Design an enzyme around this catalytic site. Structure first.
Site, short mmCIF file in Angstrom:
data_model
loop_
_atom_site.label_atom_id
_atom_site.label_comp_id
_atom_site.label_asym_id
_atom_site.label_seq_id
_atom_site.Cartn_x
_atom_site.Cartn_y
_atom_site.Cartn_z
N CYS A 505 0.81 -1.20 0.00
CA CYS A 505 0.00 0.00 0.00
C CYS A 505 0.85 1.27 0.00
O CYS A 505 1.84 1.37 0.72
CB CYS A 505 -0.95 0.01 1.20
SG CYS A 505 -2.00 1.49 1.25
N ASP A 550 -2.95 -1.89 -2.77
CA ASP A 550 -3.80 -0.72 -2.64
C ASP A 550 -2.89 0.47 -2.84
O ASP A 550 -2.39 1.07 -1.89
CB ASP A 550 -4.50 -0.65 -1.27
CG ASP A 550 -5.55 0.48 -1.18
OD1 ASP A 550 -6.30 0.70 -2.15
OD2 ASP A 550 -5.62 1.16 -0.12
N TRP A 552 -1.75 4.11 -5.23
CA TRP A 552 -2.31 5.25 -5.95
C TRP A 552 -1.22 6.25 -6.27
O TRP A 552 -1.49 7.28 -6.89
CB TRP A 552 -3.39 5.92 -5.11
CG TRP A 552 -2.87 6.53 -3.85
CD1 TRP A 552 -2.36 7.79 -3.71
CD2 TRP A 552 -2.83 5.93 -2.55
NE1 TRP A 552 -2.00 8.01 -2.40
CE2 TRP A 552 -2.28 6.88 -1.67
CE3 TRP A 552 -3.19 4.67 -2.05
CZ2 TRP A 552 -2.08 6.61 -0.31
CZ3 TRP A 552 -3.00 4.41 -0.71
CH2 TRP A 552 -2.45 5.37 0.15
C1 LIG Z 1 -8.06 3.44 -3.69
C2 LIG Z 1 -7.38 4.71 -3.24
C3 LIG Z 1 -7.00 4.84 -1.89
C4 LIG Z 1 -6.37 5.99 -1.45
N1 LIG Z 1 -5.97 6.11 -0.01
C5 LIG Z 1 -5.37 7.23 0.43
C6 LIG Z 1 -5.00 7.37 1.84
O1 LIG Z 1 -5.31 6.49 2.63
N2 LIG Z 1 -4.36 8.52 2.27
C7 LIG Z 1 -4.08 9.58 1.36
O2 LIG Z 1 -3.54 10.59 1.76
N3 LIG Z 1 -4.46 9.48 -0.05
C8 LIG Z 1 -5.08 8.36 -0.50
N4 LIG Z 1 -5.45 8.21 -1.86
C9 LIG Z 1 -5.22 9.33 -2.77
C10 LIG Z 1 -6.38 10.26 -2.53
O3 LIG Z 1 -7.59 9.69 -2.91
C11 LIG Z 1 -6.27 11.62 -3.23
O4 LIG Z 1 -5.91 11.49 -4.54
C12 LIG Z 1 -5.27 12.46 -2.52
O5 LIG Z 1 -5.73 12.73 -1.25
C13 LIG Z 1 -5.12 13.75 -3.26
O6 LIG Z 1 -6.41 14.37 -3.33
P1 LIG Z 1 -6.46 15.97 -3.40
O7 LIG Z 1 -7.85 16.46 -3.70
O8 LIG Z 1 -6.01 16.50 -2.07
O9 LIG Z 1 -5.39 16.44 -4.46
P2 LIG Z 1 -5.63 16.56 -6.03
O10 LIG Z 1 -6.13 17.94 -6.31
O11 LIG Z 1 -6.63 15.55 -6.55
O12 LIG Z 1 -4.21 16.36 -6.70
C14 LIG Z 1 -3.66 15.10 -6.79
C15 LIG Z 1 -2.36 15.04 -7.49
O13 LIG Z 1 -2.46 15.36 -8.92
C16 LIG Z 1 -1.31 16.22 -9.20
N5 LIG Z 1 -1.66 17.15 -10.22
C17 LIG Z 1 -1.99 18.43 -10.05
N6 LIG Z 1 -2.29 18.98 -11.22
C18 LIG Z 1 -2.16 18.07 -12.19
C19 LIG Z 1 -2.34 18.09 -13.59
N7 LIG Z 1 -2.76 19.31 -14.26
N8 LIG Z 1 -2.13 16.99 -14.29
C20 LIG Z 1 -1.75 15.85 -13.71
N9 LIG Z 1 -1.56 15.78 -12.35
C21 LIG Z 1 -1.76 16.88 -11.58
C22 LIG Z 1 -1.03 16.88 -7.94
O14 LIG Z 1 0.34 17.32 -7.88
C23 LIG Z 1 -1.35 15.93 -6.92
O15 LIG Z 1 -0.18 15.17 -6.58
C24 LIG Z 1 -6.11 7.04 -2.35
C25 LIG Z 1 -6.49 6.91 -3.69
C26 LIG Z 1 -7.13 5.74 -4.13
C27 LIG Z 1 -7.52 5.61 -5.59
#
Ligand SMILES: Cc1cc2nc3c(=O)[nH]c(=O)nc-3n(C[C@H](O)[C@H](O)[C@H](O)COP(=O)(O)OP(=O)(O)OC[C@H]3O[C@@H](n4cnc5c(N)ncnc54)[C@H](O)[C@@H]3O)c2cc1C
Ligand SMILES: Cc1cc2nc3c(=O)[nH]c(=O)nc-3n(C[C@H](O)[C@H](O)[C@H](O)COP(=O)(O)O)c2cc1C
Length: 552
Positions: A505, A550, A552
């Site tokens: 994970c 698991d 991501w």
């Molecule tokens: C099954 C699963 C389980 C998960 N479990 C966890 C967990 O337990 N703990 C945890 O912290 N997270 C976890 N995640 C990840 C989580 O769901 C989120 O994606 C994470 O928290 C980021 O969300 P956000 O809205 O804060 O950031 P977001 O706004 O969604 O940004 C996410 C990422 O995309 C990048 N990004 C920004 N702009 C662009 C662009 N223009 N093009 C491409 N990439 C870009 C960013 O730098 C960033 O790293 C999990 C994901 C999945 C699918």
């Protein structure tokens, strides 16, 4: 007879081909009803994929392969259900199918995703209408598409109490909100607990919690500037009606990079002909390397692109259809067990804060919300958020005597904290635990060792046998979980021999790949088999259901 066309895409090529095939197949067979489906939309959980895929008559799959041969994000959930713990015999005998693959021969794993899904489909009963398509992007992928299409027609011609979910979420208070890093840390990891006392909402160890989030107001203000209409604009269009500010806040994905079809949609409403032509060019085959560099590699948000093309003024109907994708819930690996936290859902969330290649400062939309969420302790008025639970396969063995190998550095620790709470409640109740090992990893004892004292207590109670920790930045030297696994290669192999379950994970792109290589390396040297056999061995663990990821 039905025809469903699935797609897994990142930049939109796989989706374009899927639209194209449908449009053209509707011309040939004007009676039969078609349907274009994103694989993420098709089913909310695995039980849903099952109940639906069996009811299928004809299905085409447009699957693009990314990083190290993995599926796109919108198909990762489908891919994991279909290829892992997937021994379900021949349950698709009524199914007719064909899969065209989107790949690039310059990569190690050429069209890996398409090949894997294609092989399994026939092994599990379905009937091939056409051989798997192998389009590569370094040559002409469109040409392979038309050849595949031309191969398909001959065979296709002679064939033709509440449920809480994403649409009805539960509104949960934030009961606890806590920094897990020390003050010295330059990063942040939030521990957060959602209160579900009295709600009826249910979860199991290893499930996911989905959280609905708003765009930050800075993001909305800027999108309001670019569209150049009042915040209070009401409109038709499928989310429920609201004003423009609300729609941009709640349903618009604004910060992701524009798919090629989004560029096409903007281009149809660009006033300046050189801007219309440039957007079109960027969406076309000829503009592929430009698109890959200027859009995808630079990680340009939709808002950046629209700013570069000021004359692109799409109507709200077009903007909320083909320009700005729907804002998605974010999912988190629940880091508690129901047997301990009966009335709370625990979350371990890393703060997303990064400087993009353009210099743009990206704040993660959901993680920034959790960072700022107000808990009961400080509360006169706590924060709350709409949540739901999604079942997963990341589960402990039914038999608690079966050995468990857990590998989760950083935030990857989350569901393992749930694994250990569950084992802890088991052992307090008389159930015997079998062997246990957790490979954890962080930067520094004095910054980054999340849940350190809880881990000590888990060892202390016998919920967990041994804890191995890798430190990547405590000075001159650098260690990772790969290196700790290698040191315990013999112990790991012996556990596999005794039927251990393996769990990984955390970071998908880096850690997960390196951990994967190590298993192969361990299998070769401890198992005394060559490279080809060991890959067979590791793949066997996956399809058996004893190697779970698991990531991501
Ligand atoms: C099954 C699963 C389980 C998960 N479990 C966890 C967990 O337990 N703990 C945890 O912290 N997270 C976890 N995640 C990840 C989580 O769901 C989120 O994606 C994470 O928290 C980021 O969300 P956000 O809205 O804060 O950031 P977001 O706004 O969604 O940004 C996410 C990422 O995309 C990048 N990004 C920004 N702009 C662009 C662009 N223009 N093009 C491409 N990439 C870009 C960013 O730098 C960033 O790293 C999990 C994901 C999945 C699918
Ligand atoms: C980061 C990245 C990794 C890729 N990895 C692979 C790969 O491992 N194997 C492969 O066959 N193609 C790979 N490709 C090629 C893509 O599959 C190709 O660009 C595809 O046509 C994109 O499909 P899409 O536009 O629908 O997202 C990769 C492309 C990128 C950008």
């Amino acid at each position: 007879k039905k025809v469903t066309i699935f797609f897994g895409t990142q930049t939109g090529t796989a989706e374009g081909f899927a639209k194209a095939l449908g449009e053209e197949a509707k011309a040939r067979y004007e009676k039969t009803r078609f349907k274009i489906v994103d694989l993420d939309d098709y089913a909310a959980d695995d039980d849903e994929y099952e109940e639906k895929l069996k009811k299928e008559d004809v299905a085409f799959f447009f699957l693009a392969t990314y990083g190290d041969g993995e599926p796109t994000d919108n198909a990762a959930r489908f891919y994991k259900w279909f290829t892992e713990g997937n021994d379900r015999g021949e349950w698709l005998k009524n199914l007719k199918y064909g899969v065209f693959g989107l790949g690039n021969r310059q990569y190690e794993h050429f069209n890996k995703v398409a090949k894997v899904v294609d092989d399994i489909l026939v092994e599990q009963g379905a009937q091939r209408l056409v051989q798997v398509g192998l389009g590569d992007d370094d040559q002409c992928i469109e040409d392979d598409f038309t050849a595949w299409r031309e191969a398909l027609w001959p065979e296709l011609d002679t064939i033709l109490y509440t449920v809480f979910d994403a649409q009805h979420p539960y509104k949960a208070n934030v009961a606890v909100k806590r920094e897990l890093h020390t003050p010295e840390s330059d990063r942040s990891c939030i521990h957060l607990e959602f209160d579900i006392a009295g709600s009826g909402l249910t979860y199991e160890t290893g499930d996911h919690v989905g959280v609905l989030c708003d765009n930050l107001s800075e993001t909305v203000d800027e999108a309001l500037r670019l569209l150049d209409m009042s915040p209070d604009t009401y409109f038709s269009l499928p989310f429920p009606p609201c004003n423009l500010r609300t729609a941009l806040t709640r349903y618009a994905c604004l910060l992701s990079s524009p798919k090629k079809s989004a560029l096409v949609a903007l281009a149809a409403h660009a006033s300046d002909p050189t801007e219309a032509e440039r957007l079109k060019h960027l969406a076309s085959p000829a503009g592929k390397d430009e698109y890959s560099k200027w859009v995808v590699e630079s990680q340009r948000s939709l808002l950046e692109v629209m700013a570069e093309f000021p004359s692109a003024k799409p109507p709200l109907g077009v903007f909320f259809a083909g320009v700005a994708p729907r804002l998605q819930p974010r999912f988190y690996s629940i880091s508690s067990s129901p047997k301990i936290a009966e009335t709370r859902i625990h979350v371990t969330c890393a703060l997303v804060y990064e400087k993009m290649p353009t210099g743009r400062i990206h704040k993660g939309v959901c993680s920034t919300w959790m960072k700022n969420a107000v808990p009961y302790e400080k509360s006169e008025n706590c924060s709350s958020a709409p949540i739901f639970v999604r079942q997963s396969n990341f589960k402990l063995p039914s038999d608690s005597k079966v050995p468990i190998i857990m590998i989760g550095p950083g935030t990857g620790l989350a569901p393992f904290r749930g694994f250990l709470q569950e084992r802890l409640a088991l052992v307090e109740s008389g159930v015997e635990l079998g062997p246990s090992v957790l490979f954890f990893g962080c930067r520094n004892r004095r910054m980054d060792f999340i849940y350190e004292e809880e881990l000590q207590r888990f060892v202390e109670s016998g919920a967990l046998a041994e804890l191995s920790v890798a430190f990547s930045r405590e000075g001159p030297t650098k260690e990772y979980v790969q290196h700790k696994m290698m040191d315990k290669a013999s112990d790991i192999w012996n556990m596999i021999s005794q039927g251990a379950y393996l769990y990984v994970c955390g970071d998908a792109k880096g850690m997960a790949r390196d951990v994967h290589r190590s298993l192969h390396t361990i299998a070769q040297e401890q198992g005394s088999m060559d490279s080809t056999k060991a890959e067979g061995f590791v793949k066997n663990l996956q399809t058996s259901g004893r190697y779970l990821r698991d990531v991501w």
